[PDB]
Structures are given as C-alpha cells and as structure tokens.
C-alpha cells in the first residue's frame, strides 16, 4: 500500500518488492538470485543451512532442465519443507502455511481448509502440495518463471476483503519466519467467517498519558464474553490495563468465565 | 534430465514417467487477461510433465489457447 | 512400488543423501522378513486354484443372489462366474506379489488404486470381494511370520474395500 | 472457444463486415432449433454413466487383448483411466452440442490427444472403437420418441454424430 | 469471448462437470433473447451509414476543435475525417456483433481490450467516442428487448471509456 | 451451491466485472424455469409419503435379500426399514430443493459430496438407491418442463451413484 | 454464496423439512418480480461509471481534507484506489441485487472491510458518505420512469437501498 | 548479460591471461566516450513515446493492409501489442547502448522473437520496417546539435545504428 | 523404481503369472546375499568423500586440460559442479547396489545425461574416465578383507562393477 499506511502497518518492504522472473539465457548470478528468493519465500524466511539445500534440484534449474515453478514444487515437496511445516504442525496450520508460502496470501474461507483437509486425507502430502502449485491462482499470478511473492496486502481480483486483514496474522513482519509447530491464529475467524482487528506495525500502540502505571505500559486484552454483575453489551470486548493491573484483570476475566483471544503490548 | 525431481514421491511405476510437451501459439486471450506475468515465447516451448500431471498441464495449455504439437517420452 | 528398499532409497534420494544406518536397518528388516514372505508366496501359489475356487464358492454361498440374478454384474451365467474367478484370482495373485515384494506396493499399483471407480462403474459390490478375501485368510494354512504378513495384505485389501 | 453465434461473428470481423441478411436468417433458424438442441444435451447427460459403461463393456468384449494381463486397460488404475477418458470425450461432445460449434471439443479435448496416446502407448484405434460405441448408444438416446414432444431432430442428430466422428478420427 | 453459451461451458469445464439444469437454463435465456438481438442487429446494419455519419457529425458539433485544429489526431482534413468515420463504424459494427453473439465478447475481444493504450498513444479523446455512442443510442429507433440489449452494449462501451 | 444466479455472479466476480447482458440472460433463463420448478417441488412434496413408501418397497422387491439378511446394513428389521425410508426421503426432499434452487447445488452440497465414502463405510449398495430413484422418476406424474427438470436432478443422482 | 432461492433451501434442510406451501408461494412472488430486478441491475450497471465519478466528485467537494495534500485520497495511487473501492462496492451491491441475497456482498466485500479501513487509516465515515451518495443516485436511476414498461418497483427499490445501507454500515 | 567491460574480461579469463595494455587502453577510449553514450541514451529515452508513435503511424500509412480488418494490427488488443513490441525493441536498443554490448538485446529481446512472430502470424518484415523508422528518428534525435555540448558523436551513432539493424534483422 | 524383488513382480504381473518356484528360489538366493549387499553399501558410503576426491585428483592429473583456464573444470563453480557430478553418480550407484536393481540409477541419473553433457560442453569421455577411477577404488574398498566376517563377495562385487560400467557407458 501507499507509504502513509504501509509505514504504520510494517509492510513498506512488501510494497516495494518486485516480482523476480527467470529469463531466457539468464546468467549464473540470476539463477543464484532466483534460488535464494525461492528458498526465502517457500521456506518462510528460515535461516537455510547449506546441508538443507536441494543440490540436485538446484542443478536442474541452473541447467534449464526444470522451470522455476518446478523448482518451487521440488522445494515444497522436499523433506526440508515437510520437517519445517508439516510433521510437527496441525493440518490447518499446515494449510495456511502452504497458502502463505505457495500462493502468497491467507486463506479466504473455511471451505478452503475443508478442501485441503479432504485432499490430504485422499491423496496424501504430494497431492495436497501439487494442488497449490497447479492451481489457476498459481499459474495466473506467477506462471512457470516468476518466484512466488506475498500478495495478501494488495487488492487481488476475486479475493475477499477479509484476505487483507487476515494477511497480518500469517505475515508478522520482514524479520520474521514461520519457524516455531504451533496453532493457526485464523482458526476461529475462518470457522465463523468473521474478521479480526489488525494490530501490526505500530497500530497496536495506544496512548499512555498518566494512566499506564509504574512501567508506562498498557496491555490490550481481547476477550469473548457473555452474561453468566453488570450488563454485558458486546460479546467481543477489549480492555486496556497497565502492567500493575494485568494480573487483576486476568483474574477478573477468568472468574467471569470469559475467553481471552489475544493479549499484546499497547 | 529432470526426472529425478519431476516424478514426485509416489514411488509408483505409473508416476515414474516423464513426457516432454512441445507447445506453440501461446498468446494473449481472454483466458489470461488477468495474468500478472508476461508471455515471453509464442514459438515452440518444451514442457517436461510427469505422468501424474498430464491431465493438468494439458488442461492448462488448452485453456490458454496453446497447441500441443508433440509429446515425446522422456 | 512401495517396498522397504525402494522407500528407503526414495527418501534418501529426495534428501540428496547417501544411504545411512537408518536405511541399512530397513534392509535388515527386509531380510528378516524375506524368506517367510517367499515361503508364503509359494504356499499360496501352490494352492491357488483351491483357494480361488473355494473363495469364489464362499462368495456365492454368502451372496446367493449373485448366481440367481440375471445381469452383466452378476454370476448367474458362465460368463460372470468366470469373471468372478478371474477377479478373485487377481486378488490372490497380487497378494502373492506383495509377499514377494515385502509391501503393499503391488496391491496399490495393480489393484487398489482405481478399484473404487471400477466397482462403482460396473456395479460390483465390494462386500463380495471382502468375503472372498476372508475365505482366503481362513484357508491359506500359513503360520508364524508367513501368516502375519499374508493376513496384513489380505486385511489391507479388505480395509481398502470398506 | 466459439459457439454457433460467435463462430459467424469471428468470420465477419475478419472480413470487416456486418452479418448479411442470409447469415442472420440462418442464425435465426439456429435459434428455432434451440429447444431440440437442449433436449439432446439433456438426454445424453442423463444417460452418461450408462453410455460410457455399456460402451466400455462392449469394447472389452470385442477386444479382450485390452483387459488381459499386460493389456493397456489391465489393472484398476488403467481401467479407471480408460473409463475416465471415455467419460471425458463424451462430456466434451455434449459441450460441442450445447454450443453448436466444434471448437471446445477440438481446442480443449482433442488438442494433442493423439500424441498423448502414442506417447503413453494407449491404442488410439481402440479408443476410436470405444467412441463409436458411445456414438451409437447416444444417438438412439437422443432419437427416442418416448416422453418428449414429437418433432424432427435429424439435423441435430447429424451434428452430434459429426462431433463423435471428429473425436473418433482425432484418436484413430 | 463472453457469451451465455461459452461462459456456460467454460464454467462447467472448469469444474470438470457435464452440463446440468443450470446450464440448460442459461441456454433458454439465450434462446429467449436471440431473436430480439438478431432483429436489433439487422436494424442497426440497415441504418449503419446513417447512424455512423450522424454520430460523426455529432462529435464534430460537440467538439468543434476536432475539425479546426491541425494534427494527426484531429479531423481537420479529409484524412482525419475518414479515420474518424472508420472508428465509429468499428464501434457500430462490433456492437452488432455483440447483439448477434449475445454478450460483450466481441466488444471485449476486438475493441475494448487495449483501447486505453491506443487512445493515449495516438492522443484520441475517449469523450469523442462517448459522444458518438450516445448519438447511436439516441437514433437507432429500437424498442423493447432489442433496445435494452443494444443500449447495454453501447453503455458497456461508454463505461469502458469512462 | 450451483444455481444459475450464483454461477452468474461467481463468474462475473472471478472476472472482476459488472454483470452484463450475458448474466441478465442467465436470470431470464432462471425465470422461465422457476415456476415450473416450484410446482414440481409442490407436487413432489404433496406425494412424498407415497413416493418414499413406494420407492422403498420397489427396492425391497428388486433386492429381496435386503429384507431377509441380518446385518446393520440391511432392512431385515424395523430399524433397517426406517433407515432405508429415511434415506430415500432425504433423496426426494433434497431433489425438491434442487427444483426450488434451479440447480444441482442442493444435491451437491447436502447429499452427493461424501456419499461414496458413506456407502462404502456402512456397506450400502449404490444400486439400492438407484432403484429407488428410478421408481420416483416413474411415479411422480409430472409433465412438461416440471418432468424434465425433476428428471434431470434424479438422473444426476443416479449418475453420481453409477 | 446464497441467492434468494438457496437461502430458503438451506434453512429448510437444516430443519429437515420440505418447503411449505407459503414458502413456495413467496418464491413465486419473487419470480413475479424478476423482470424488475433485472431492469434495476441493468440500469445501475449501465450508469456505473457516472454513479461512481459523480458520487466521488461530490464527496471530495464536501470533504476537501480527503484530497488536500497529506489527505487519504491524495496522490494518484490513493485516489485511484479510492475510486476503485467505490466501484467495487457498487459492483457487489449489484451482485446482491441480482441474487436477491446479501451473502455475496457481506462475505466477499464487507466482511473485514472495517478492519481493513481502520488498519489502513481510510476514513470509514467518509466511505460511508460516498456509499450514501451512490445510493441516492442509483435509486434515482432505478426509479426513472422513462423508457421502460411502467410498474411499481417500490419493493425492489427498498431492497437495493437495504444493500447500500449494509455497505454504509459496514465500512464505518 | 555483458557490458563493454565484462565482454573483455570474459574473453581474457577463458585464455587465463591479464588484459593487455592495448585492451586497457581501448577500454579507456570507451570511458572517454561515456558522456556521449549517456547523452544518447537520455535523448532516445526522452523521446521514446514520440519515436514509437511516429514510426507506427508511418508504418501503417506505408502498409495499410496491417490495419485493415483482418490485418495483423487490426483490433485494439493487436494494435496495443504491436505498439508494445515497438517500445520493447526501442527499450532494449537503449539497454544495449547503455551497456555498450548487444548481449542484453540479443538474450532478452531478440532470442526467439522470429519464432514467436512466425507462430503468431505477425509479419516479421513489417516489424523490421517499423524498427527502421524508429532507427531513423532515433539517430536524428541523438544528433540534434541544439541544447548540448558540441562534439563528434559519429562513433556512438554508428554503434546505436548497429543495434537497430540487429533488431530489424532478427525479425526480418 | 524397482528393487530386485519388485523387478520380478512387475514382469510376472505383465504376464499374469505367479512367480515360479525357480524365481522364488532365485529370490531366496538373493536374500542369502543380503548381508554382503548391506556391507558393500556401507563400505562405499563410509569412503564416499575419499573415493570422489581421489578419483578427481587422478582425473585432473591425467587430463590437465580440464583444469587449465578455459577448460571445462576451470573456475570454482565448474570445478565444484564437476565434483558434485562425481558424487551424484557414486551416490546413485550405491542406491542401485542397495536395491539390487539398476532402475534408480538409470531412471534418475543416467537417462539423458549424455545429451545434457553434450549441450553443456561437458566432456562425456572425461566423466567416464572419472567414473572408472571411482569404480576401481570402490571395488577395492568393498573387497578389503580386514575387519569383516570373511567370505566370498565376488557376486556382489560383480554387480557393483556392472553399475559403475552402466554409469561410465552412459556418459561415454
Ligand atoms: C430430438 C432432440 C427429440 C425432440 C425434441 C424436441 N423438444 C421440443 C420442445 C421442447 N423441449 C424442451 C425442453 C426442456 N424444457 C425444460 O424445462 C427443460 C429442462 C431444463 C428442457 C430440456 C422445451 C422447453 C420445449 C419447448 C416446449 C414444447 O414442449 O414444445 C420439440 C418441439 C419443437 C421445439 O423446438 O420447440 C422437439 C421436437 N423431439 C423428438 O421427437 C426427438 C426424439
Ligand atoms: C423499476 C425496476 C422500473 C420498471 C421495471 C419494469 N420492467 C418490466 C418489464 C420488463 N423488463 C424487461 C427487461 C429486459 N428485457 C431485455 O431483453 C433486457 C436486456 C437483457 C432487459 C433488462 C423485460 C424482459 C420485461 C418484460 C416485458 C416488458 O417489456 O414489459 C416491468 C413490467 C412488469 C414485469 O414484471 O415485467 C416493470 C415494472 N418499471 C418502472 O416504471 C420502474 C422505473
Ligand atoms: C552526441 C551524443 C551529441 C553530443 C554529446 C555530448 N555530451 C557531452 C558532455 C556531457 N553530457 C553530459 C550529460 C549529462 N549531464 C547530466 O547531468 C545528465 C542528466 C542525468 C546528463 C545526461 C555531461 C555530464 C557531459 C560532460 C560535461 C559537458 O557538458 O561537457 C559532450 C562533450 C564531450 C564529453 O564526452 O564530455 C558531447 C559531445 N554532442 C553533440 O554535438 C551531439 C549532438
Ligand atoms: C564383502 C561385502 C565382504 C564381506 C562381507 C560379509 N559380511 C558378512 C556378514 C555380516 N555383515 C553384517 C553387517 C552389518 N551388521 C550391522 O549391524 C551393520 C551396521 C548397520 C552392518 C553393515 C551382518 C549383520 C552380518 C551377519 C553377522 C556377521 O557378523 O557375520 C558376511 C558373512 C556372510 C553372511 O551372509 O552373513 C560376509 C561375507 N566379507 C568379506 O570377506 C568381504 C571383504
Ligand atoms: C546471536 C547473537 C544470538 C542468537 C541468535 C539466533 N537467531 C535465531 C533465529 C533467527 N534469527 C532471525 C533473524 C532474522 N532473519 C532475517 O531474515 C532478518 C533480517 C530481515 C533477521 C534479523 C530469524 C528470522 C530467525 C528464525 C529463523 C531461523 O532460525 O532459521 C536462532 C536460531 C534459533 C533456533 O534454532 O530455534 C539463534 C540461535 N542466539 C543467541 O543465543 C545469541 C544471543
Ligand atoms: C466375483 C467376486 C463377483 C463378480 C465379478 C465380476 N467382475 C466383473 C468385471 C470386472 N472385474 C474387474 C476387476 C479387475 N480388473 C483388473 O484389472 C483388476 C486388477 C488387477 C481387477 C480387480 C474389472 C475391471 C471388470 C470390468 C472389466 C472386465 O470385464 O474385465 C464382472 C462382469 C461385469 C460386467 O459388466 O461385465 C463380474 C461378473 N460378479 C459376481 O456376481 C461375483 C459375486
Ligand atoms: C479406454 C477406452 C482406452 C484407454 C485409455 C487410457 N488413457 C490413459 C491415460 C491418459 N488419457 C489422457 C487423456 C486426457 N486427459 C485429459 O484431461 C483430457 C482432456 C481434458 C484427455 C483427452 C491423459 C492425459 C492420460 C495420461 C494422464 C493420466 O492418465 O492421468 C490411460 C493410462 C495409461 C497408462 O499407462 O497409465 C489409459 C488406460 N486405454 C485402453 O486400452 C482403452 C482403449
Ligand atoms: C472520431 C470520433 C475522431 C478521430 C479519430 C481518429 N482515429 C485515428 C486513429 C486510430 N483509430 C483507431 C481505432 C481503432 N482501431 C481498431 O482496430 C479499433 C478496434 C476494432 C479501433 C477502435 C486506431 C487503432 C488508430 C491508429 C491507427 C490507425 O490510424 O488506424 C485517427 C488518426 C490518428 C493518427 O495519428 O493517425 C483519427 C483522426 N479523430 C477526431 O478528431 C475525431 C473526433
Ligand atoms: C488543467 C491542466 C486542466 C483541468 C484540470 C482539472 N483537474 C480536475 C480534477 C482533478 N485533478 C486531479 C489530479 C491530481 N490529484 C492528485 O492527487 C495528483 C497527484 C499529486 C494529481 C495530478 C484529480 C485526482 C482530480 C479529481 C479529484 C479532485 O477534484 O481533486 C478538475 C475537475 C474535475 C472534476 O470533475 O471535478 C479540473 C478542471 N481542467 C481543464 O480544463 C484544464 C485545462
Ligand atoms: C474512497 C471512497 C476512500 C479511500 C479508499 C482507499 N482504499 C484503499 C485501499 C484498499 N481498499 C481495499 C478494499 C477492497 N479490496 C478488495 O479486493 C475488496 C473487494 C473484495 C475491497 C472492498 C483494500 C483491500 C485496500 C488495501 C490494498 C490495496 O490498496 O490494494 C486505499 C489505499 C490506501 C493506501 O495507503 O494505499 C484508499 C485510498 N480513501 C479515501 O480517502 C476515501 C474515503
Ligand atoms: C507491430 C510493429 C507489429 C505487430 C506486433 C504484434 N506482436 C504481438 C504479440 C507478441 N509480441 C511478442 C514479443 C515479445 N514479448 C516479449 O516479452 C518480448 C521480449 C522482452 C518480445 C519481443 C510476444 C511474446 C507476443 C505474444 C504475447 C503477447 O502478445 O503478449 C501481436 C499480437 C498477436 C496476436 O495474435 O494477438 C502483434 C499484433 N503486429 C503487426 O502487424 C506489426 C508488424
Ligand atoms: C567432472 C568429473 C566433469 C564435469 C562436470 C560438470 N557438470 C556440469 C554441469 C551439470 N551437471 C549436471 C548433472 C546432473 N545434475 C543433477 O541434478 C543430476 C542428477 C539428476 C545430474 C546427473 C547438470 C544438470 C549440469 C548443469 C547445471 C549445473 O551447472 O548445475 C558442469 C558445469 C558446466 C557449466 O557450468 O557450464 C561441469 C563442469 N566437467 C568436467 O570437465 C569433468 C569431466
């Protein structure tokens, strides 16, 4: 997005990224750059050890035996990808990782989860991975020669608006990676077809003044609450409390039986 | 070369087969109006395809107006 | 085909790795099993006709409408009875391949993959074949390791059909 | 792809010409056959599974080399691929019938299909024999006078048969 | 080339599906429409030179500078007037194609895609063509569904230019 | 759920386009059909009890073993007969939805997606339900466009089971 | 996505019931209004570019802070995005009108739009004002009695107003 | 790609030898021409739209068949593509001028271009003619003596003319 | 890929026959060799780096043109690629030894390698020579009688030699 919003949201570097295409008669440097970009994208920006590199697939790409899309698929099917993102993750976390890594977006609806859980149950891991790379969405955005890149922060034809808000759950900043498994932050909002506020970059910040206690820190607690006391006006609530009152607030929420969905510094 | 990577992990006799598609005439159509990348070659382009993805690549090419001029076993 | 040795290499190759002790242990595991598997294969092969005939009759006994109803999918005529024996023979023969290969590879490759579509298209009940497979489990006369491996493949097919 | 209407448009634009009165009248005559065309599409579709399976059974009876061990349709996977191809070809024939133009069949189904079968070792001539048996079953379905407003469908039936012939020739 | 019939098959094909009642209904909606479109196509064709000549003059009246200023992009000389009448003829003829086809397909394929690049490259104002298309809407004398479908295509072209 | 109105928008949306004459024609096709579908739904609903009872009886006649053999998948006790009549009732009811919706969407969403796994897991023969659907096709007494659209949905189910 | 027919169907299935006589008759009534619905969709679509640009001009004239340097619709990139959004919303409104159900508008366009605008710093209240402007122009266009078979479009006009209202409520 | 420098380095390395004193001197002469090379790149670039649009206009006037209905540059998408190709070629010509080596033009623009046009049915000879017209206007623009420090640019103009001639030959 | 067991299965299936007693006994004989097979894989694998590095030094000593400037093994990338290729071939020979069938080596490594090297300019004959040197050292390593239960490994050594010869013959 434009500087005014991208700066607040921590996505300036994403906005200025340029799709990388492997051209005919590319140099050795250009192939090297492409291999690096694929590893960064498909492996979610993990530090890649030399022992983990796909020696053979790299050779074939460099020899123009296989396309960039073939090389993306080789990496996605590799044991490295499996160990990083599949063997230690629940399925729905695995699926959103595939959407981030391979399509550069967040899942749009629960039925995408259902489709891919069914496909894994039917044809296993390879069939699941191939669905992303062979999809119309992959072919029309990246084709055979362009390295995948994150798309979720830009208006895409045939996207859902909530794809933009959800992007911030799966993209956590430039200096981040999908390395620790874990659970999906998207589970509830996918299942119930809703959206969640975007607290990223500097949008989590809230004013302190003289009301933020001894450490001048506020914490934002997002809860789901019901009336099991004073009247509850909203099923979803946020509380801003200082560090000194944070234990009391948790205990209050806990005593009321309400669910904490997220807590972060404000 | 390429079979080692193109053929997936199925470890099946049927999937352990690669075919080289020769496709020509890939051009702009309403099918790829929204495509975010440029077509670089409309002459003969050769695409290695494992048996397990022949349906998909054939559909992709045909949906894109490409002509399959030959298919050769690897 | 999926067997202990090819899966070992397939995994090693995908990692671009020489075979290591893990794969050698897989090979030793195959060797521990091979002779019993070869003995099971010979025993099933020698009694193939008896097993196939017996299994086919077991199906007819349990599903008598198959030999009484006219239709392309049933065995009321000699044509269907021959189809049926052939099919049961296929299951039996491919099971012996699994014992030779040491895995479900042969069943997966030659019989199981696509069987759902075949049975649906030609209106063949998978319950028929389950019964034939159960008969074979009950009459092949194996024991020990040979019995355990053979029944695992028969059950693998049974589970695939249900 | 083209349909019956856009086929004429593309030819007219290449010449830079409005459609003539004769072309408009011919397309108006096409519209008048529309209901019969829909009926034929509906009838083939409602009998798709029977058309395929009966055609397949007859093929394998005529050509037992296909299903015996080592045959190209032996093993479940190959049998299923064979049945699938028969269904695919029939589906695209109904597409061509529905649009009234052969382009969808030729551009999306028959494109490179002969080369596919040669590369795989699928006997293309046996495929053609299978397609012929589906054609014969399909036309009788379309021509059935029972349970439908009576009229002459021989023109549409002839068009359908050509789509089947084109598919058969494409592999054989 | 977007028309009801091709879009119906495109959709079913992308789903790997035979045609169903949904697509048949699309066909009926086409059949309900086609004759009015063909009649609209005929009426526009027969009145084409009158419509084109009038629309051209309407542009010259609305934008007098286009007949007074020198430059390749203008119609001050006969060269530019010829180009201009040709262009308007293209819009009218292709619009008739849309009525024949039953969708914007012909406008999308032959005229709309890339129109912005041409108009910017050769410095042609979209407003000139909007005025021409407005004239044609105002003078084709169509009624009923012929008018409705024809105006949709004219408006489609106008919207693409705006 | 596939229906003409949702397919039209899905296609337009995937293309990032306003609805055009093509989609308007799809709506007209829907309108031409809708009243006949609604009447078909009403006629089937009114006769449902008789249709469902006759279908179950038809299946039991064609497949007598289903009412004679013990087992959870058969109808030899009242438990099984109730399951069977319930299932057939589902098929009929969801077919009425397709007539209301004007598309197979309801069959796809509620019944067909997953039916193969159910029929295999619980060992229900698809041929049983085919026979039931045949019976409903013969005995629903619809005519004209109501008969055609209703039969298209019944045949769609028959084809999915075949 | 639902339309008017499938919304009712889905509720019926969840209840395990056939559609009642009155529900079918209510659907018959919706069918009776179909032509007016199509005309409304066709009219808004046909005037789409003007509805957006007029509503956009009026918005920026009332709220000059949007286009002032440093404003949220200042610079070509943000202005273009803003115009795109107005068209997007109008497009999804026409989709909901065409289907007779809000699901397409809600699920695909509105859900997450508030969070999106808050995140971006787009003034949702301003977007709501633009939507209101498009609302009034569209209804005037839909309600224009010239060049159309005369009848009462009050119900459809109310429905369309409803969808516009959903969008206005959503973005703030 | 190579530039004028790395072209010499690459040849030197294959022989395993240091650049000769005359090779270094020759590159020094290239450096002495750097400002004129930069000016020529800037001048062509500044006039790129005019160069393309004028040459295209000249081409279609000289070759009316191209733009008649059915002609290759007829329809907006085809005209658009044709204009794009002219600009692509001009752009890669400047790249080659900037680097002082043809490798960029050959590798990224001209490689496969003849086959592309043959497959598409683009008349390559007409493309070559359009490239000639672009060449002519470009060299006049580069040689325009006004508003620039005076000097002899004949060497750079010859080098540029070669790149244009390379492009025209690759298609014709 | 095939192993020693599934190689026989696939052939038997193609004929629709059970394995014969002769075939099962042959397979039982292979089982008896299993420990020797495993030891040979282990020994080659344990010395893989030395086999490659010594083979490469010996090859560049006999063929110094490979490592002079402009030679095919000159520059670090080419030298590293050359050493990689040697290790890849050795790796696939151990796969073939482990499986007791040549298919993994042939399907994945050798099929098409000759054509690939020809296009690259890699001297296929020199590669074959290097494969020979690795073969000779590898066979000596397998045969080392020290530290292992003494026995006759002549059959397994002949098989391994055959795999090296396939590799050598496939490049030159
Ligand atoms: C050759 C194909 C056979 C044949 C066809 C035929 N059909 C009609 C007329 C109609 N058929 C339909 C079809 C449908 N109505 C629906 O609601 C649907 C379900 C989605 C379908 C498929 C319709 C609407 C008509 C028009 C009304 C009518 O019943 O007449 C005709 C009559 C001529 C015409 O084109 O209208 C014919 C000839 N008739 C035969 O004898 C062939 C076996
Ligand atoms: C409120 C919406 C306005 C209004 C509408 C209105 N329209 C009709 C009737 C028809 N409108 C159409 C529309 C089209 N025909 C086409 O071919 C196309 C192009 C794709 C379109 C959009 C049709 C087919 C009809 C029926 C035939 C007729 O011309 O009447 C009515 C009449 C009632 C009805 O339900 O049909 C009405 C009320 N009328 C107004 O006064 C409002 C401003
Ligand atoms: C043939 C190409 C024409 C020509 C060129 C020419 N240019 C120079 C000298 C210079 N030109 C520049 C250019 C720029 N300075 C900038 O800041 C930028 C903007 C980014 C540009 C493009 C510069 C820096 C010089 C050097 C200083 C100077 O003005 O002299 C010369 C003189 C010789 C030289 O090589 O420097 C020449 C000959 N002259 C002609 O007559 C041709 C029409
Ligand atoms: C030719 C290859 C050389 C040779 C081999 C040889 N080995 C054996 C027997 C065995 N070798 C092993 C191997 C391993 N045991 C382990 O735990 C591992 C580490 C993972 C390995 C590699 C085993 C288990 C046996 C059997 C028990 C034993 O200690 O002997 C033989 C004997 C014949 C047999 O089939 O067992 C032979 C001949 N011997 C030579 O002289 C060659 C130089
Ligand atoms: C070293 C002084 C300290 C230390 C470091 C440490 N870091 C990691 C893991 C990661 N470090 C980063 C950071 C970046 N990645 C980027 O791309 C950028 C630039 C934009 C940065 C700054 C990331 C993303 C990771 C995670 C991904 C990955 O580990 O591959 C580790 C590894 C932890 C682990 O293995 O689980 C370590 C050890 N550790 C210390 O003890 C020092 C104080
Ligand atoms: C026996 C338990 C019952 C029975 C059998 C029967 N089968 C068929 C037809 C086919 N059987 C198969 C099965 C296979 N083909 C393969 O290649 C393999 C894998 C190795 C298997 C398991 C197939 C594919 C068919 C159809 C094609 C063919 O006929 O070869 C029939 C005839 C069906 C028909 O419509 O012709 C019959 C009768 N029928 C009974 O009633 C028995 C209880
Ligand atoms: C059946 C009558 C005959 C037969 C068929 C057969 N075909 C294949 C394999 C393929 N068939 C196709 C064709 C298509 N795929 C598509 O998606 C479409 C266009 C939409 C077409 C026309 C393809 C691409 C394949 C290969 C890919 C795949 O099967 O998934 C086989 C399998 C061959 C094999 O060795 O596996 C078979 C058996 N075979 C006969 O013997 C009959 C005469
Ligand atoms: C008329 C309203 C005004 C006008 C017209 C004018 N047009 C051109 C040049 C071109 N017009 C087109 C347009 C099309 N070509 C197509 O193939 C199609 C789609 C089927 C369209 C709409 C094009 C491509 C050109 C450029 C190439 C060509 O000349 O054919 C000119 C001349 C521009 C020039 O520089 O030569 C003119 C004058 N001009 C007016 O002043 C009128 C008000
Ligand atoms: C002056 C050469 C001619 C002219 C100008 C004119 N412009 C507008 C309206 C707008 N101008 C812009 C331009 C920009 N906005 C930006 O943010 C930037 C980037 C920094 C630019 C260049 C925009 C976006 C508009 C529309 C919104 C707005 O009103 O600001 C108008 C009025 C158009 C209208 O409908 O209101 C006019 C008159 N008009 C002439 O006749 C001059 C020859
Ligand atoms: C115009 C009235 C107001 C305005 C708009 C504005 N919006 C954005 C950015 C985005 N708008 C959307 C919305 C959608 N994208 C979709 O795909 C859909 C339909 C499914 C919707 C509803 C999104 C996702 C974005 C962000 C991503 C993108 O910009 O592509 C901007 C740009 C903000 C920036 O900093 O770039 C603007 C300007 N702004 C105003 O001031 C008006 C009140
Ligand atoms: C204009 C002077 C002539 C002309 C051109 C024309 N070209 C095409 C189509 C393509 N042109 C290319 C060329 C390139 N693409 C690249 O990326 C590069 C390298 C960086 C080059 C040189 C390609 C690949 C195509 C096809 C794909 C695409 O169009 O994007 C057309 C259209 C052909 C069609 O049928 O659509 C045309 C018209 N045509 C003439 O008549 C002039 C002589
Ligand atoms: C070393 C003894 C000789 C030698 C080798 C050499 N090879 C290449 C380049 C390639 N080698 C391969 C081969 C493979 N890649 C794989 O992944 C596999 C398994 C499937 C094999 C067998 C390939 C594909 C290439 C090209 C791509 C790449 O460079 O990685 C080179 C480099 C040549 C160059 O860079 O131009 C060299 C030097 N060269 C000799 O002189 C020795 C005889």
Residue numbers in the entry:
A (entry chain c): 2 to 181, 185 to 232, 236 to 273
B (entry chain d): 2 to 75
C (entry chain E), E (entry chain C), F (entry chain G): 1 to 162
D (entry chain D), G (entry chain H), H (entry chain B), I (entry chain F): 1 to 172
Copy the relevant paper text.
Cyanobacteria use large antenna complexes called phycobilisomes (PBSs) for light harvesting. However, intense light triggers non-photochemical quenching, where the orange carotenoid protein (OCP) binds to PBS, dissipating excess energy as heat. In these massive macromolecular assemblies, light-absorbing phycocyanobilin (PCB) pigments are covalently bound to phycobiliproteins that are tethered together by linker proteins and organized into the PBS rods and core cylinders. Using cryo–electron microscopy, we unveiled the OCP-PBS complex structure at 1.6- to 2.1-angstrom resolution, showcasing its inherent flexibility.
Here, we take advantage of the latest cryo-EM developments to determine the structure of the quenched PBS bound to OCP to a resolution of 2.1 Å in the core and 1.8 Å in the rods, with some regions reaching 1.6-Å resolution. High-resolution details were readily visible in several parts of the map, for example, in the rods, where characteristic holes in the density of aromatic residues became apparent. Previous cryo-EM reconstructions of the cyanobacterial PBS suffered from inherent flexibility of the complex that made rods appear “smeared out” or incomplete. The overall movement of the holo–OCP-PBS complex is dominated by movement of the six rods that emanate from the core region. The rods rock “up” and “down” in small angles as rigid units relative to the core. The overall displacements are in the range of 20 Å, and they are less pronounced in the “forth” and “back” directions. We previously proposed that the rods in the PBS are mobile and that they can adopt distinct conformations that control access of OCP to the PBS core. Our flexibility analysis shows that the rods have an inherent propensity to move, in agreement with that hypothesis. In particular, the inherent movement of the PBS rods hints at a conformational switching that controls access of OCP binding to PBS.
